[PDB]
Design a protein around this ligand. Structure first.
Ligand code: GVY
Ligand code: CL
Ligand code: CL
Length: 182
C-alpha cells in the first residue's frame, strides 16, 4: 500500500517512492553529499575513526570530534546530534553501528521531523566495523521508512538517500527495492 516503481534518474542512482518520500541509493563517498542531515555509523563511545567514521570525523573537523566526546561523557546516549562542521549539512546524527538498525533509522527520521528538515543522507549503517549482514541492514532501513509513513509521521521529510562505499553492497539494496516495488 506504499511502494512506487524503481527507476534510474541519474547515472548510478536508483530511486522509488515510499508513500510521500523519495528513497534513493547510490555508491560513492558520503562526505561529498549535501543534505539537511548526514548520518555517521560509529561505536558506543562515538570516537570510532575507521571506515565511514574515519572519513566523516576527518572531513567534519576537530570541533565536531570535541562535541562528540563532550556529549559522550555527560550521559549514556543511544545516538548523538552535533553540528555539521565542514560537511555540507546542518547536523550530523551519530548512530551506533552495532545497535538495531530499524530503531536507529526511526530515531533519525523523528529527529529530522522535530527540526522541519526535508533531506537525509546515510551510509549502509552497521556493515563496516559492526559487521552486520548487508541483506539484513537493507531490510531494516527500508522497514523503518515504511513504518514512519504508515504512522502518518512523514510531513517535512521528503528525500532519504543511502550512499554506499562498496558497489557490492549497493547491489543488495537494489535487489531489496525490486522485491518491494508496486
Ligand atoms: N568494508 C568496508 N565497509 N565500509 C568501508 C568504508 C566506508 C567508507 C569509507 O570512507 C571507507 C571505507 S570498507
Ligand atoms: Cl558500522
Ligand atoms: Cl557504507
Amino acid at each position: 500500500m506504499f511502494y512506487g516503481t524503481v527507476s534510474s534518474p541519474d547515472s548510478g542512482v536508483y530511486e522509488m517512492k515510499i508513500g510521500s518520500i523519495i528513497f534513493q541509493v547510490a555508491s560513492g563517498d558520503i562526505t561529498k553529499e549535501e543534505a539537511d542531515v548526514i548520518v555517521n555509523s560509529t561505536s558506543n563511545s562515538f570516537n570510532l575513526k575507521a571506515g565511514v567514521s574515519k572519513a566523516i570525523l576527518e572531513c567534519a573537523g576537530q570541533n565536531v570530534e570535541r562535541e562528540c566526546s563532550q556529549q559522550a561523557q555527560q550521559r549514556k546516549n543511544d545516538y548523538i546530534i552535533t553540528g555539521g562542521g565542514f560537511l555540507r549539512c546542518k547536523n550530523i546524527i551519530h548512530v551506533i553501528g552495532g545497535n538495531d538498525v530499524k530503531s536507529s533509522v526511526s530515531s533519525v527520521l523523528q529527529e529530522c521531523e522535530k527540526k522541519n528538515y526535508s533531506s537525509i543522507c546515510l551510509p549502509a549503517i552497521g556493515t563496516g566495523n559492526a559487521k552486520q549482514h548487508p541483506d539484513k541492514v537493507a531490510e531494516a532501513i527500508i522497514d523503518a521508512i515504511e513504518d514512519f509513513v504508515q504512522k502518518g509521521s512523514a510531513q517535512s521529510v521528503k528525500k532519504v538517500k543511502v550512499v554506499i562505499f562498496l558497489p557490492q553492497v549497493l547491489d543488495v539494496f537494489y535487489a531489496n527495492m525490486k522485491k518491494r516495488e508496486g
